[PDB]
Amino acid sequence: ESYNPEFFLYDIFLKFCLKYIDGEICHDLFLLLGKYNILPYDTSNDSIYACTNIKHLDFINPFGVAAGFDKNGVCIDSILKLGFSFIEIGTITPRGQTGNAKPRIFRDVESRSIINSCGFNNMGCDKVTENLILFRKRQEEDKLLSKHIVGVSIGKNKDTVNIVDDLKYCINKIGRYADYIAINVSSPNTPGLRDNQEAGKLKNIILSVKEEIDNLEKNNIMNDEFLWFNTTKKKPLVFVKLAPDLNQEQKKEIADVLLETNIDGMIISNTTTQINDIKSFENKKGGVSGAKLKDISTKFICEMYNYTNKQIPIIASGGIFSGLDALEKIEAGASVCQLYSCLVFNGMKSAVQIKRELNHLLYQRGYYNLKEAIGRKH
Numbered sequence: 001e002s003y004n005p006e007f008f009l010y011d012i013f014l015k016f017c018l019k020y021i022d023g024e025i026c027h028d029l030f031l032l033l034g035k036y037n038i039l040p041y042d043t044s045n046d047s048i049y050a051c052t053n054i055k056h057l058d059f060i061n062p063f064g065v066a067a068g069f070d071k072n073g074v075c076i077d078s079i080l081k082l083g084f085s086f087i088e089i090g091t092i093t094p095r096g097q098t099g100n101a102k103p104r105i106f107r108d109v110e111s112r113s114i115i116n117s118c119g120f121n122n123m124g125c126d127k128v129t130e131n132l133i134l135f136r137k138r139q140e141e142d143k144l145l146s147k148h149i150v151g152v153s154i155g156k157n158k159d160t161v162n163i164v165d166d167l168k169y170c171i172n173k174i175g176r177y178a179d180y181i182a183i184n185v186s187s188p189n190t191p192g193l194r195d196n197q198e199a200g201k202l203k204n205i206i207l208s209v210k211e212e213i214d215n216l217e218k219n220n221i222m223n224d225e226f227l228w229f230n231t232t233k234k235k236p237l238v239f240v241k242l243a244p245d246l247n248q249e250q251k252k253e254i255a256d257v258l259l260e261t262n263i264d265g266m267i268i269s270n271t272t273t274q275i276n277d278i279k280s281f282e283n284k285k286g287g288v289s290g291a292k293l294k295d296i297s298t299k300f301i302c303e304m305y306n307y308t309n310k311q312i313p314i315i316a317s318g319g320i321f322s323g324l325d326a327l328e329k330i331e332a333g334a335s336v337c338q339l340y341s342c343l344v345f346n347g348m349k350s351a352v353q354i355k356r357e358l359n360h361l362l363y364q365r366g367y368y369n370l371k372e373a374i375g376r377k378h
């Protein structure tokens with residue numbers, strides 16, 4: 001669709017909610033509108049020149065929704081139908097968690113930034129799996145959901161003993177319904193602050209996850225069409241989400257581990273705790289998203305692309321609002337882009353607008369297709 005009065009109507013309403021209403025209340029209200037399917041669709045064809053892929057995972061367009069937006073997979077269809085090629089649901093944990101004390105999400109309109117200390121609030125693996133299953137069933141009968149990718153972000157409980165025990169439990173429950181799994185070792189907001197990113201630990205963590213996935217394939221007697229009730233009809237790829245608050249050595253050490261473990265991709269990056277010059281946020285705890293994160297994460301993409309010798313596919317996040325923002329991420333080495341803050345500040349038109357902007361920009365820079373632009377800034 002577009003341009004629409006439908007889009008425009010909701011973007012007035014959203015700007016109103018932004019001025020007057022609590023962020024988390026607004027988010028939940030819009031998730032609820034999405035669940036009842038009264039939000040706009042982008043029914044347009046995506047440019048065959050902005051297709052992209054990660055290994056054998058194929059994206060109709062280079063834009064997805066980041067993790068934390070739909071933690072419980074209650075709104076997947078409606079978010080996808082806004083014009084995104086994929087969504088990363090979660091982060092989920094083996095059991096439900098309330099998360100930290102409310103209010104825990106604050107916005108700063110002028111810097112177009114967000115700070116949050118949610119602390120992995122989610123309904124837990126079992127309920128979210130049931131939600132994802134219902135989505136997969138709907139997807140079989142919904143033409144606008146065909147070839148759309150759902151990844152699942154997985155983490156640990158707040159009091160949990162061993163992180164790995166948690167990841168394995170999630171994999172066994174939800175893995176069959178996922179096109180990829182994102183390992184969340186990077187959230188500030190669960191104590192660590194980082195769920196362990198230390199290279200030896202990570203290596204163990206990556207290996208354990210691949211194995212669980214492998215195990216699902218071995219244990220089951222059904223053919224793949226049947227086992228993988230997902231989009232790809234294959235086993236989920238394994239990504240890891242990294243925090244930008246690391247030093248060059250830590251980054252070098254992580255880069256080696258990713259190569260050693262043969263990880264399918266890295267999501268660069270999560271929220272930062274290194275931002276200070278946001279006045280409204282000075283009394284606040286958590287990680288910062290949005291425009292202030294942009295250059296930090298772009299620089300981080302560049303480094304990890306270099307350190308991994310261009311061998312590991314990158315998913316970019318965040319501070320991405322414009323087609324230019326997207327191209328910067330792509331030329332630094334990202335194959336695909338995730339949006340979060342952009343939806344908060346720019347509303348229903350985020351995917352429609354950013355796709356148009358990037359298409360026009362890819363054209364006016366001589367690139368024949370998107371894949372030509374990946375890593376070209378180096």
Ligand SMILES: Cc1cc2nc3c(=O)[nH]c(=O)nc-3n(C[C@H](O)[C@H](O)[C@H](O)COP(=O)(O)O)c2cc1C
Pocket residue numbers: 066067068069071090091105114116118120153184187241269270271289290291293317318319320338339340341342
């Ligand atoms: C309120 C909120 C909740 C989030 N929850 C998660 C989460 O559950 N898991 C995760 O990996 N990232 C989470 N994130 C981080 C985002 O996925 C994203 O990486 C970050 O916002 C940077 O993108 P952006 O600048 O476009 O917002 C959350 C971010 C915010 C704003």
Ligand SMILES: Cc1cc(Nc2ccc3cc4ccccc4cc3c2)n2ncnc2n1
Pocket residue numbers: 014015017018022023024026027028030031033034039075078079082105107343344347348
């Ligand atoms: C005003 C505001 C909004 C918001 N969240 C949004 C914004 C856009 C959304 C679009 C959707 C589109 C389809 C389905 C669900 C959707 C859910 C949405 C949720 N937040 N979050 C933290 N502060 C916020 N302030």
Ligand SMILES: O=C(O)c1cc(=O)[nH]c(=O)[nH]1
Pocket residue numbers: 068091116117118119120121184186187188189190270271287
């Ligand atoms: O749940 C959260 O608090 C959270 C998780 C995460 O990975 N990143 C973030 O900024 N917040």
